[PDB]
Design a protein around this ligand. Structure first.
Ligand SMILES: [Mg+2]
Ligand SMILES: [Mg+2]
Ligand SMILES: [Mg+2]
Ligand SMILES: [Mg+2]
Ligand code: NA
Lengths: 210, 209, 209, 208
């Protein structure tokens, strides 16, 4: 950082982290023969780049802190319209189409707070063309301290796979003994620092940042 | 078969012949030079504005790019939708560096002009630009009452121009000034992504965010 | 191709779907397991022996690979030219780890068998392998006086096999054991480079040197 | 540390280095009359570590003292390069300069010996025509020799290719163009230098 011309070398250029990368095709192939099942998807930075709404929320309710995340007024705006500014991730499209082909039941489990009304389910169904037969209303698990709110829902809906970008998404899957697969969080996300994908030895989907 | 394409060390270390530069190297290259005029493209250069453009398309032209011609879209985009635009860190670093030098900052955009705009305000607030170095956003185009980006670069005598698109760089070369490329983010809705360095120009590292 | 091809952030971040592992991860996966038999291919796995093959080609077959079938080449290659072979650091780490475990180490090669060989001594000296864990190099082949690689893997009951070639990995698969891939250096003369991970196998990171 | 993981900012992170290709170098010389250019030898045009490795194992297993043993240089300069592997990056550069009609010079820091077959090895491996070939130049700090810098000025070289920092500073001191070649990761000459540490041009994929 304090070096004007750091230069580089071939050992560093070729250096690789010991991560288990997988592709959508590889995941689909690993599911050959398996009958329809319940699968879950994280929302923020997994299927939607929702930073635009979280950014406006921060500037609007807590310019110098994260208190906006605990403000009921922020969640009202976020879950009822701000996802109109959320950009769908290509990696998610491919996964959702793949699961739709298998006839799998799709669930969305988010750490967002639950509000009286929400249009998130609709935005997800419309943007990813999810048939009514595979779609399920979004589950707002919320976020409590010293506890992982995702676990209860993964267990009750008997989800066999869970896609997520955060550590708590992956550890939740591990707690339930199911297959947790990591999605890369975009570099321009406002939710930092970026998590260390593969920090639990889990499978990480290549090029899933967009 | 092609389920596992694998890879090899030659592919892992392969590099494209690009002239990469850092903000600190740019600064160092300007040491001793007096304050000057510098310009910045806006979209995908200093602001990740795809959210607004994405909503604009889904709202006015779901199956095409016609929304880019709809005056109703531009009224919304230049008057508030940038509150949903994410400022780029690379830009922040560049702007702070130019402010320290006392340079005069200009913003040139190909966005359509509207009677009113709050983009200038959003830019000055998000990047904490002093009024001394701030200048109202300039909207360029092919229209009769408006000058092209080239004409604006010459008129203000900009010595450096930052941008993510090929037209941003060629304009700079056509004026004989220094054109520096900014990387466009992979999740931008404006695709395909351009080839940074395709003109042998300098490209700022890790400038995608 | 083109003079100034440039690049984009999607391409810069693109990753192949490969299962990378580190030596530390391999050791951890062996925790608690009693001493066992493991095997290593030789060329481009534990030794960068291209210098000997390069000189062989230049001396006996400048225009082809006919030297690989010349008895005169193998006499020199297995009795001294490996003094010019450079040990790989990835291999040292793997061998040191298996030595700490007390495992028996076997070296399997597809090199033509000669009446005498100094390769075994070269390997033992270079990787400081204790007498109890060292075993004479095994020359595998088609000849009626020798067994294939698969046969040796089974006969010695090797649980793991390290190699840089596709046939090294398929050999491990056929025997139902754990085949682990080592990257072949880009300056090796044995080309083209194989596609590490083409069989979904584990590939050791930074194992090109 | 067992599972360090990674993130996309780290995967796309680039060092601020000025990379160039042989084609871009050729293009920048468009229209220039034939000139003199120079190449370092070890890890620049030849992967000579095999011989240095054997030398080390034979005279200084635990150190680099072999680099000052006369017995080592006699063998290194008269035959061990038969095990030295030509670099493809250098092959392209040399062909490119030969096509332009430029004069090729090879400057090395290896200790000078009575006889040497290195010149022969280079001319044959890279098929350099007599009209462009010149005997290897052994530069040094001894009173009977000239420094690399003096040789660059003497022969009026306009470009110097090398993998080491001193190769680049030598060119800088002469006011000529110094271009960096990447040293192979399996070279025995460690640690690897930081290519670009002088803001100089660095040739892509030049490790092999
Ligand atoms: Mg998330
Ligand atoms: Mg732009
Ligand atoms: Mg091999
Ligand atoms: Mg050198
Ligand atoms: Na989550």
């Amino acid at each position: 950082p304090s070096t004007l011309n750091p230069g580089t070398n071939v050992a560093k250029l070729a250096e690789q982290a010991p991560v288990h990368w997988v592709s959508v095709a590889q995941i689909e192939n690993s599911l050959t023969g398996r009958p329809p099942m319940a699968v879950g998807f994280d929302i923020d930075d997994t299927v939607l780049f929702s930073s635009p709404g979280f950014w406006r929320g921060k500037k609007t309710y807590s310019p110098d802190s994260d208190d906006y995340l605990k403000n009921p007024a922020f969640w009202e705006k976020m879950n009822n319209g701000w996802d109109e500014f959320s950009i769908p991730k290509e990696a998610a499209r491919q996964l959702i189409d793949m699961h739709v082909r298998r006839g799998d039941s799709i669930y969305f489990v988010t750490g967002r707070s639950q509000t009286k009304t929400e249009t998130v389910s609709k935005t997800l169904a419309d943007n990813f063309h999810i048939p009514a037969a595979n779609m399920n209303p979004v589950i707002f698990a919320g976020d409590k301290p010293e506890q992982n709110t995702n676990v209860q829902w993964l267990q009750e809906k008997n989800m066999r796979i869970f896609y997520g970008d955060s550590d708590n998404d992956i550890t939740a899957a591990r707690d339930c003994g199911i297959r947790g697969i990591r999605i890369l969080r975009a570099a321009n996300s406002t939710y930092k620092p970026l998590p260390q994908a593969g920090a639990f030895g889990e499978e990480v989907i290549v090029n899933s940042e967009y």
